[PDB]
Write an enzyme that holds these catalytic residues in place. Structure first.
Site, PDB file in Angstrom:
ATOM      1  N   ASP A  35      19.393  68.667 -58.870  1.00  0.00           N
ATOM      2  CA  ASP A  35      18.557  68.294 -59.853  1.00  0.00           C
ATOM      3  C   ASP A  35      19.069  67.726 -61.045  1.00  0.00           C
ATOM      4  OD1 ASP A  35      16.456  68.404 -61.670  1.00  0.00           O
ATOM      5  OD2 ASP A  35      16.072  70.335 -62.024  1.00  0.00           O
ATOM      6  N   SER A 199      14.487  51.584 -69.428  1.00  0.00           N
ATOM      7  CA  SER A 199      14.032  50.539 -68.550  1.00  0.00           C
ATOM      8  C   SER A 199      13.625  49.335 -69.091  1.00  0.00           C
ATOM      9  CB  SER A 199      12.923  50.911 -67.327  1.00  0.00           C
ATOM     10  OG  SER A 199      12.541  49.892 -66.808  1.00  0.00           O
TER      11      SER A 199
END
Ligand SMILES: O=C(N1CCC[C@@H](O)C1)C1(c2ccccc2)CC1
Length: 330
Positions: A35, A199
């Site tokens: 994770d 992004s």
């Protein structure tokens, strides 16, 4: 040194991925959910409330000659989906794919939430976010990567998750045969303890690319792609019959649909998530309504590039003094 381990989806929907991890002496192999969105290595154990164990493999510290109780230390964690676990702490030897760390904090669960009990395939979590998020008290502990870092050939690990197929976690090296083209690297902020990056925008299907900054985290421990409501609405508008359902808890779509791809920007590069990756199947057995793999982050407080996004790429988690993230097509 290096390590290389195969990671395998837990079910037919890629709801999560498990990776075998050796703990203790002799080794006890548990299948852990790696994770990158948390920083605790915790396991089902001989100390876990018996009623809360249902098919998981447990770590038994008393059977490990290298286990030592970390006196006074406790831990308690809650995840984004409301799951939780807590307990006490041992140090022991932990190996992943041939890479060994001695003295790793192994957080033994005394209590786990129902969601963990109900998933027989996950024996615990191995956190790969920054150690500043580690919950051990009164002495915070380091992640497996943080402990291994100085011994690694290069201070990196890579995630290569498969679509309905096994993939690989590598530690200490970049497998240049595992991706196509070049890896595009992008800046990371560690201010919230995550692999947080921005992004450069998105496209839906064969549509034009929208240049827009989307700040989010690369999180292997989250199944879906969670993005701003504007972006998610633009995606699902291209699927006839798709709608956000309050009762179901997100966007659903007719199972008869062909889903468009979704592209996200990494610098000037583009990662394309095929439409199929966005199908999470019937909302309940036999239903013709299917759950979408791209959902709104509006209720979360952060955008999350989870498995739906990451499995479309070869992803480099670069833990150099100034960390960065790299993405390649594959
Ligand atoms: O077992 C889990 N799964 C996620 C949801 C779909 C299931 O198939 C798998 C849970 C989890 C895993 C990792 C982090 C936080 C929660 C909820 C316990």
């Amino acid at each position: 040194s290096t390590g290389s381990a195969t990671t395998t989806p837990i079910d037919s929907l890629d709801d999560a991925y498990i990776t075998p991890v050796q703990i203790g002496t002799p080794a006890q192999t548990l299948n852990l959910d790696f994770d990158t969105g948390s920083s605790d290595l915790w396991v089902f154990s001989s100390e876990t409330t018996a009623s809360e164990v249902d098919g998981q493999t447990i770590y038994t510290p008393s059977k490990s000659t290298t286990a030592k109780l970390l006196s006074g230390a406790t831990w308690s964690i809650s995840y984004g989906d409301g799951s939780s676990s807590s307990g006490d702490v041992y140090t022991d030897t932990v190996s992943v794919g041939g890479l060994t760390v001695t003295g790793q904090a192994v957080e033994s669960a005394k209590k786990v939430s129902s969601s963990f009990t109900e998933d027989s395939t996950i024996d615990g979590l191995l956190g790969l976010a920054f150690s500043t998020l580690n919950t051990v008290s009164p002495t915070q502990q380091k992640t497996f990567f943080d402990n291994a870092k100085a011994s690694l050939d290069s201070p990196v690990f890579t995630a290569d998750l498969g679509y309905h197929a096994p993939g690989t976690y590598n530690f200490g090296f970049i497998d240049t045969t595992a991706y196509t083209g070049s890896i595009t690297y992008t800046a990371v902020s560690t201010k919230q303890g995550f692999w947080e990056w921005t992004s450069t925008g998105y496209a839906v299907g064969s549509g034009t690319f929208k240049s827009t900054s989307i700040d989010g985290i690369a999180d292997t421990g989250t199944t879906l792609l969670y993005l701003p409501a504007t972006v998610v609405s633009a995606y699902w508008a291209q699927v006839s019959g798709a709608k956000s359902s309050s009762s179901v808890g997100g966007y659903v779509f007719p199972c008869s649909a062909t889903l468009p791809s979704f592209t996200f920007g990494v610098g000037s590069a583009r990662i394309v998530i095929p439409g199929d990756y966005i199908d999470f199947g019937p909302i309940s057995t036999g239903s013709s309504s299917c759950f979408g793999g791209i959902q709104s982050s509006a209720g979360i407080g952060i955008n999350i590039f989870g498995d739906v996004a990451l499995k479309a790429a070869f992803v480099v988690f670069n833990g150099a003094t100034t960390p960065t993230l790299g993405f390649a097509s594959k």
